[PDB]
RNA sequence: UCUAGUCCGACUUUGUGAAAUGACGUUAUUUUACUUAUUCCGUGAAUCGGAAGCGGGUUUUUGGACCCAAGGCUCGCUUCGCGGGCCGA
RNA sequence: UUUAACAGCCUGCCCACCCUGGAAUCGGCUCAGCCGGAGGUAGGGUCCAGCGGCUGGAAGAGCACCGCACGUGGUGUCCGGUGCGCUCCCGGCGGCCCUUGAAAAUCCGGAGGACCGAAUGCCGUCCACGCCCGGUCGUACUCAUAACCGCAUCAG
RNA sequence: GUCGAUCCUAAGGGUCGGGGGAACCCCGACAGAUAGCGCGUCGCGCGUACUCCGAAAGGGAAUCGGGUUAAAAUUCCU
Ligand SMILES: [K+]
Ligand SMILES: [K+]
Ligand SMILES: [K+]
Ligand SMILES: [K+]
């Protein structure tokens with residue numbers, strides 16, 4: 001018997017796709033690795049003052065990189081921990097990242113290792 | 118236990134909310150359900166010409182079971198059975214026979230057998246759609262003096278021949294061991310369809326109104342009848 | 348010529364009804380078993396103003412016949428209705444102002460409003476402020492009822508049609524003069540884009556049959572036939588007569 | 599600002615039936631109405647039993 | 654000199670009846686009956702139709718509340734606890 | 743001649759509400775209204791607003807002033823009055839309409855009580871405290887008698 | 899994370915199905931087996947044909963002082 005005057009489509013089984021062949025032969029290579037994310041440090045006078053005043057490293061990064069990926073790229077690249085990352089898109093269309101290291105790390109020491117100072 | 122008590126509910130207009138009720142007859146069914154139900158009603162509302170009305174007079178249930186039981190004894194071989202005999206013949210051919218007695222199916226093949234007068238019994242499904250495929254078969258069988266019957270279910274006929282459906286079946290000859298009971302079946306079938314063919318040519322079917330319409334019409338004629346005696 | 352003003356209204360656009368602040372359609376309950384056989388009690392919760400509608404509206408709450416929930420309704424308020432009043436709808440509802448009854452149960456000479464034309468259409472007749480219908484007679488053989496409409500016309504409706512007892516509230520509205528163009532502006536601001544009206548004789552020929560001429564005058568009979576095509580049918584349409592209605596004409 | 603995480607429970611509740619939804623006077627009116635109306639139904643029920651047996 | 658629209662008639666959609674009248678078993682006209690075509694109205698398609706019981710000759714002083722069943726009967730039961738069936742309706 | 747968000751405590755406007763009590767020789771009351779046996783005046787309470795008060799924040803800051811050196815120290819930042827004043831916000835009342843002057847996201851509360859613990863150790867907990875996390879895009883500058891439009895660094 | 903966009907809906911816009919249309923297109927939830935949601939752990943319950951677009955002045959979770967640049971900040975520093 002039916003207690004509802006409105007007919008509802010009954011639930012029916014649905015299977016998950018089990019393709020006989022993969023549409024793509026192999027996964028695509030990672031196009032946003034650590035080297036791709038971190039293009040090069042910024043060596044302007046304004047950028048340099050932030051190395052010691054704020055313990056901050058200024059990087060030019062891929063425009064498609066987010067703060068989450070920038071944090072991991074810096075960890076893999078220079079083996080340093082980050083307190084916070086601020087990003088902006090410059091008028092020339094490139095992305096700049098202000099990376100502040102934790103007190104446990106010294107930006108000036110890391111800057112010398114990079115080779116900008 | 119005195120703590121248990123009866124808590125009756127007073128139903129009616131403005132009373133306690135009625136419990137769940139069966140509202141099946143008021144369900145707003147999908148389009149497909151609605152059309153097939155209206156299709157059934159429309160057929161019986163309109164007058165059915167005799168050539169189409171003869172298919173409502175199907176074979177009786179009691180005689181149908183006997184006829185279908187005999188058909189099961191002449192089923193065509195299955196796909197597995199068909200392959201099994203062909204390998205028995207291949208070995209026989211390498212190592213240096215009787216005509217089968219089975220039911221004939223297929224409208225094209227059955228019609229040929231009827232025209233050639235090699236058919237001894239024709240079984241016709243009543244639910245062939247489009248009906249024009251078999252609406253003429255009873256006339257052909259009558260003209261050829263071959264007994265025929267109309268049974269319910271093309272699916273049932275198909276199951277005999279290992280097919281989803283079958284419009285009609287034919288028996289060109291039965292095995293000699295059971296030619297007596299088969300002869301009796303022909304007499305009953307021939308007396309119900311072939312003999313009544315002429316009288317059924319003027320029996321128009323349909324014209325049946327709905328239950329509410331019939332009750333309303335019957336009430337009106339009672340007033341006329343009640344006024345006839347006075 | 349160009350498309351005249353009367354023709355441009357049918358396209359919609361700037362002539363659609365102004366309905367942004369309207370409270371919704373005012374109508375009876377959907378006809379159901381309770382009203383067909385017995386009666387259902389409702390309670391008036393508030394009497395509200397509907398922009399563009401002179402007659403006040405009443406919000407009524409009903410107990411749903413078979414669902415555990417409240418059933419909200421919006422009725423055209425009858426004169427005398429008040430908040431907290433019980434309103435009874437159904438075949439067996441008593442004859443009191445505010446109740447909704449089928450015409451079959453309403454005696455001759457009663458005053459009713461919001462009368463259904465078709466059984467279950469929820470009311471099409473006598474809905475404006477101060478208007479009502481009068482039950483004339485019943486025809487048990489045909490199952491129909493005769494009622495007098497506000498315009499004075501007599502109409503046949505099936506006896507199953509429902510009607511609210513009493514007249515529509517807010518009567519006498521049109522007696523008060525507006526006195527000002529601005530009052531007319533506010534009136535039609537919430538109805539539709541039909542005010543102000545420019546006279547055809549003040550237009551040019553391109554846009555109205557009455558336009559043009561070195562004097563403002565129609566120049567041809569303002570009475571036009573019924574079958575005149577759109578754009579030509581202006582003025583007194585299919586006028587059976589004209590002039591001041593004196594004598595039996597103004598009855 | 600009424601969100602539970604931002605406001606203590608005591609500030610968004612009243613310790614009474616229909617607390618925070620109906621005033622005290624409204625609750626009092628409903629309680630009396632519920633009791634009196636229910637009592638009247640009992641009187642109606644008993645009244646018709648006496649007339650029912652009349653036969 | 655034409656034209657959208659509009660009005661009007663025929664055929665078509667378009668079937669089932671009856672009566673009156675008329676013409677040559679057919680057949681026109683008129684009125685009327687039927688419901689399934691077609692059209693329209695209503696709803697979140699929620700008690701329609703018929704026949705029984707019951708009553709006689711289910712809710713109206715009140716701005717409340719109202720759902721997911723109490724109860725009875727009856728099977729299974731891995732028993733005084735779960736799962737079904739029929740009433741309640 | 744200064745004092746932020748935020749946190750706690752206090753205060754309790756104009757209204758609303760509660761208890762006691764029972765009012766004409768009527769009373770109370772606003773600039774205006776208006777309110778009272780459907781319970782006034784009066785007496786005692788509750789609640790609501792705050793861009794109100796105190797403390798924390800917070801003087802360690804800021805500002806002013808005077809020094810010492812050419813970063814560093816000191817002193818002060820205090821006590822009142824006034825209003826048909828101006829800008830903004832709020833409260834409450836009244837006038838006006840044949841005009842009555844959006845919706846939804848979201849959030850809070852309520853009615854109902856299926857179901858659920860313990861013989862006292864489990865269950866429940868919108869309480870306090872502690873721990874972790876925080877995407878993407880915009881952000882410069884003009885906003886006009888020279889950064890907008892008018893062919894221009896145009897009296898528009 | 900704290901200013902906005904983003905989210906919500908307004909007048910309205912774009913659409914499924916259906917109905918039109920030689921077709922470009924027209925109508926726009928109106929001719930229809932909606933979307934799914936809730937609670938247990940895959941089962942029950944509910945279920946009225948749009949999970950769409952539409953506001954940097956409507957609605958709306960949360961940041962305040964002090965300091966800092968040649969040019970940035972309720973975003974940087976404390
Ligand atoms: K034109
Ligand atoms: K206008
Ligand atoms: K005018
Ligand atoms: K003229």
Ligand SMILES: [K+]
Nearest residue numbers: 747748961962
């Ligand atoms: K704040």
Ligand SMILES: [K+]
Nearest residue numbers: 881882970971
């Ligand atoms: K900025």
Ligand SMILES: [K+]
Nearest residue numbers: 886887896898
């Ligand atoms: K300028």
Ligand SMILES: [K+]
Nearest residue numbers: 953954956958
């Ligand atoms: K916005």
Ligand SMILES: [K+]
Nearest residue numbers: 844845956957
């Ligand atoms: K608003």
Ligand SMILES: [K+]
Nearest residue numbers: 962963964976
């Ligand atoms: K700060």
Ligand SMILES: [Mg+2]
Nearest residue numbers: 086087088089
């Ligand atoms: Mg940013």
Ligand SMILES: [Mg+2]
Nearest residue numbers: 542543544545
């Ligand atoms: Mg005028």
Ligand SMILES: [Mg+2]
Nearest residue numbers: 549550551559
């Ligand atoms: Mg002119």
Ligand SMILES: [Mg+2]
Nearest residue numbers: 348552555556
């Ligand atoms: Mg002209």
Ligand SMILES: [Mg+2]
Nearest residue numbers: 333686687688
């Ligand atoms: Mg009829």
Ligand SMILES: [Mg+2]
Nearest residue numbers: 693694695929
């Ligand atoms: Mg319909």
Ligand SMILES: [Mg+2]
Nearest residue numbers: 783784785786
């Ligand atoms: Mg007092």
Ligand SMILES: [Mg+2]
Nearest residue numbers: 797798799800
């Ligand atoms: Mg302090």
Ligand SMILES: [Mg+2]
Nearest residue numbers: 801802803804
């Ligand atoms: Mg100081």
Ligand SMILES: [Mg+2]
Nearest residue numbers: 828829830831
């Ligand atoms: Mg201002």
